[PDB]
Coordinates of C-alpha atoms in Angstrom, one line a residue:
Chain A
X1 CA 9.3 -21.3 -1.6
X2 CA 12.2 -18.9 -1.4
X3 CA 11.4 -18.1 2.2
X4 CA 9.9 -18.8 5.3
X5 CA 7.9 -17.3 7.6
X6 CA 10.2 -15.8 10.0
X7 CA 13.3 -15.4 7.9
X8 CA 14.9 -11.4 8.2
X9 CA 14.4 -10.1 4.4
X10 CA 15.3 -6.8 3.0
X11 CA 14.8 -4.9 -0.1
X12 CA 17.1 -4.9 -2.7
X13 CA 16.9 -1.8 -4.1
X14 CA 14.8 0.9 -4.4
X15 CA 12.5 1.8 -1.8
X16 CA 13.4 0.5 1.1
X17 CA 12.0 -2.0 3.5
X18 CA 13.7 -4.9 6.1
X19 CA 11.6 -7.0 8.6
X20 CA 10.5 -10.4 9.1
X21 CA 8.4 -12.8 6.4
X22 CA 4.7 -12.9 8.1
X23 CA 2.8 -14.3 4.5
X24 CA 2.7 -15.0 1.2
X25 CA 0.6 -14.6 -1.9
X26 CA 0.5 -15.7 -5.6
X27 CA -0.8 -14.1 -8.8
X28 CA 0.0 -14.4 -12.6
X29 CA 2.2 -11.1 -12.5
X30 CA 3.5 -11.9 -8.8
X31 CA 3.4 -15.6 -9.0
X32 CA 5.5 -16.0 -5.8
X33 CA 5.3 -13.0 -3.4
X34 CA 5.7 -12.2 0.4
X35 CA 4.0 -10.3 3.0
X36 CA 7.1 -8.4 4.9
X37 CA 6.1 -7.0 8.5
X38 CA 9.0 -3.5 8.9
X39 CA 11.5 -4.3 12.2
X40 CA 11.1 -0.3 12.7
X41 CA 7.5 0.1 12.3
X42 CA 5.5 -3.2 14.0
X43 CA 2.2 -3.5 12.6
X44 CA 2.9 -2.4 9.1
X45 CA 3.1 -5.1 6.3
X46 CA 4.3 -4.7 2.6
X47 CA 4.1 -7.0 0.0
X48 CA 6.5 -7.9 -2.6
X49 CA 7.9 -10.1 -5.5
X50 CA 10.3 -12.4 -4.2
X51 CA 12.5 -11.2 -7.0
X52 CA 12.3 -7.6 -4.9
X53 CA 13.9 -9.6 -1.9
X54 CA 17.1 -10.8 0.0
X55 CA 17.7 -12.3 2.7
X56 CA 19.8 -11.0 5.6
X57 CA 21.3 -11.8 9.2
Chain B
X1 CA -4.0 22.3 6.1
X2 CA -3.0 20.3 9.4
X3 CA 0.8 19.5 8.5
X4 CA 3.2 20.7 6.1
X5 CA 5.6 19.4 4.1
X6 CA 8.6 18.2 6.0
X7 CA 6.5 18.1 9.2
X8 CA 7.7 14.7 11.2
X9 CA 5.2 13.0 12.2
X10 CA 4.1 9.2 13.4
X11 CA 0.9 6.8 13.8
X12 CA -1.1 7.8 16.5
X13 CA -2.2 4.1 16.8
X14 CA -2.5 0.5 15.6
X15 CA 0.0 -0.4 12.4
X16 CA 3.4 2.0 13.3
X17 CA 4.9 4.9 10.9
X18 CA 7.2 7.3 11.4
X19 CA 8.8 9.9 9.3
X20 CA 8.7 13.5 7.1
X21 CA 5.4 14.7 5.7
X22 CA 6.0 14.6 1.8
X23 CA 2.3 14.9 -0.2
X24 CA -1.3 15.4 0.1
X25 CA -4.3 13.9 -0.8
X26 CA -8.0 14.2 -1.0
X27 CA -11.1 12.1 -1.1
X28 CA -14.3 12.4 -0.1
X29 CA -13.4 9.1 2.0
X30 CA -10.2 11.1 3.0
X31 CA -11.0 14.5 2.6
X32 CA -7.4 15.4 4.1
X33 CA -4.8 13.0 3.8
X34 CA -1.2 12.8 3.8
X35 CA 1.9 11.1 2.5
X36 CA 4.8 10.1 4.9
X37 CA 8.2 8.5 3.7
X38 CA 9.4 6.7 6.1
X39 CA 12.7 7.9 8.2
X40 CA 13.7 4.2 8.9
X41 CA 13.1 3.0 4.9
X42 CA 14.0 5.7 2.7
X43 CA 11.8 5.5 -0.6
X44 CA 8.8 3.6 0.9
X45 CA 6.3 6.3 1.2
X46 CA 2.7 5.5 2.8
X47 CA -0.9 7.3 2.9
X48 CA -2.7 8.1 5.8
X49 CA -5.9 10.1 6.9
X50 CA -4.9 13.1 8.9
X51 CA -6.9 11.9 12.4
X52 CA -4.4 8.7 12.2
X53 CA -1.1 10.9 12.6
X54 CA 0.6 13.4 15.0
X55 CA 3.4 15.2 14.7
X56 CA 6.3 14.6 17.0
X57 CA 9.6 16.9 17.3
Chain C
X1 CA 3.4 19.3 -12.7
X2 CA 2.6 16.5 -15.3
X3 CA -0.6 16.1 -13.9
X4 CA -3.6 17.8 -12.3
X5 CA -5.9 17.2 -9.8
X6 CA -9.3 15.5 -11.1
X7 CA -7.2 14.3 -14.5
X8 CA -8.1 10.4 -15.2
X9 CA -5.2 8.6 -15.3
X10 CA -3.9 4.9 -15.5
X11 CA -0.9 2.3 -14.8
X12 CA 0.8 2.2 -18.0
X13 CA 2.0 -1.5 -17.0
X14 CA 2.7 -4.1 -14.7
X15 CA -0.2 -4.1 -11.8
X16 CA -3.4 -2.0 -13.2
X17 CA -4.9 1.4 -11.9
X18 CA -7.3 3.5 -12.8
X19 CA -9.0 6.5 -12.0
X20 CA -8.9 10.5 -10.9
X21 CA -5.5 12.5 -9.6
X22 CA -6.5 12.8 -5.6
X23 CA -3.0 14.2 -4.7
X24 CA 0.8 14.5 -4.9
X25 CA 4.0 13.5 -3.7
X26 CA 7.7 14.2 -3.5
X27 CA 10.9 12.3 -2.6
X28 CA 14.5 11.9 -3.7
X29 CA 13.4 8.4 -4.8
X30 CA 10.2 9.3 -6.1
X31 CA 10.6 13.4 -6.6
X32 CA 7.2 13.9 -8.7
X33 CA 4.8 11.0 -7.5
X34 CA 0.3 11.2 -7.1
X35 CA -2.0 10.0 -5.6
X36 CA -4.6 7.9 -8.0
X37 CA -8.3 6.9 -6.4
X38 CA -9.4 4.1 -8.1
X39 CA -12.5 4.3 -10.1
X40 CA -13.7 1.1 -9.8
X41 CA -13.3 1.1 -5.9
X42 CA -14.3 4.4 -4.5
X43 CA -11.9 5.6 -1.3
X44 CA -9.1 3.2 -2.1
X45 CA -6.0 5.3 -3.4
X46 CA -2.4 4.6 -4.3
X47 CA 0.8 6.3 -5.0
X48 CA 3.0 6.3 -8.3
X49 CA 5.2 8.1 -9.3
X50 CA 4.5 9.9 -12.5
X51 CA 6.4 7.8 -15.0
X52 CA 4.6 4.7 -14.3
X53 CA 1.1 6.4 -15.2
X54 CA -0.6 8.3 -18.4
X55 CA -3.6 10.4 -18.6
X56 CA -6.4 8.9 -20.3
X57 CA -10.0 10.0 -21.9
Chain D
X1 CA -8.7 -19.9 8.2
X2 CA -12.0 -18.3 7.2
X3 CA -11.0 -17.5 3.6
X4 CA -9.2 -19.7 1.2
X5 CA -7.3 -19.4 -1.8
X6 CA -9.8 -18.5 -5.1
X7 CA -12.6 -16.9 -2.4
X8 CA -14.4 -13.8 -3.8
X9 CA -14.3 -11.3 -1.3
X10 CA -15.1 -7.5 -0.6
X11 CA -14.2 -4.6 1.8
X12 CA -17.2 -4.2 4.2
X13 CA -17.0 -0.7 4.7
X14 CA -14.8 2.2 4.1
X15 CA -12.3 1.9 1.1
X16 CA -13.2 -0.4 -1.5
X17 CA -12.1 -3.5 -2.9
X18 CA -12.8 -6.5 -4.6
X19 CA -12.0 -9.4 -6.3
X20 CA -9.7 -12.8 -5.1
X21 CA -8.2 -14.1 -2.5
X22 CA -4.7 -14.6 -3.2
X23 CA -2.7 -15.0 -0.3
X24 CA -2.7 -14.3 3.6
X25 CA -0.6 -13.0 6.5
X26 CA -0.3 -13.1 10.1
X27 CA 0.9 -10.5 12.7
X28 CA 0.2 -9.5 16.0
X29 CA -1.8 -6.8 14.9
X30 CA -3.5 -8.7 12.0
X31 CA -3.4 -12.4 13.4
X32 CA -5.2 -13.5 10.3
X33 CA -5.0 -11.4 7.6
X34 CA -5.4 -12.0 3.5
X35 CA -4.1 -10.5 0.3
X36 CA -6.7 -9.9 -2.5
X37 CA -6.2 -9.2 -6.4
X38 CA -8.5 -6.8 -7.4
X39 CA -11.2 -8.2 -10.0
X40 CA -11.0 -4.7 -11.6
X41 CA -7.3 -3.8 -12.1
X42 CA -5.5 -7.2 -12.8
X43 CA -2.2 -7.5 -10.6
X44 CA -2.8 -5.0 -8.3
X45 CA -2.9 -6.6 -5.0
X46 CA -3.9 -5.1 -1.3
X47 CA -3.9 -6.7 2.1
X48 CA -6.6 -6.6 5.0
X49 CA -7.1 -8.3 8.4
X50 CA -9.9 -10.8 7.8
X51 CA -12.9 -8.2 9.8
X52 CA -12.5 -6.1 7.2
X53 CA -13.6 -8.1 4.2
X54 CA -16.9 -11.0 3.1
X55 CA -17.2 -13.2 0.9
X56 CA -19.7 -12.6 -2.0
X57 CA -20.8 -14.9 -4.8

């Protein structure tokens, strides 16, 4: 795995969306992708393709 | 309608959002529902029922 | 508007959608998006913008 | 973990949704949540905390 739970991840580009790593889930289009709780709005989780994702600070 | 668009407006409760109202939507489920983009993550736009939101100054 | 309300309408790629125009949305990101309710699983909706979807019989 | 990986599962109430388990997440809000591929439209994926959903065969 790219990241761990935990780890501060942002989007690269597009819409936007930063927070911490709180899952993870796997499917033949998204075969490695995380569950990303937002810093600013606590409670909401979006998922994405790792490929979607950096890592920040 | 309960809000317009450009209306700011947040979760009442539960999983946080915050931002400008910037669609509509209807279902029988939903019968009046809205779309928020989010003021802290540009782009990322999500749907709510309109007894979930208020709107704040 | 590309679209109408009540028009059937699909993901043209990528992750798969299908079903009636429930609503609208506008950003800078995203500045003609709708609202699609599944037909296969009445009261769950989701937003695209309009270049990711096609109308369909 | 009440679900695993490969579980069919459904929305009890509300929205629908059905098809695989594919991943999970945890938050305060959602200690024990799970990501499921709809059965219907291949790749789309959509999280819930674990009250809202049962397994089916």
């Amino acid at each position: 795995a790219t990241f761990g739970m935990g780890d501060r991840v942002r989007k690269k580009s597009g819409a936007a969306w930063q927070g911490q790593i709180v899952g993870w889930y796997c499917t033949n289009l998204t075969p490695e992708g995380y569950a990303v709780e937002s810093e600013a709005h606590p409670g909401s989780v979006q998922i994405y393709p790792v490929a979607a994702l950096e890592r920040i600070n």
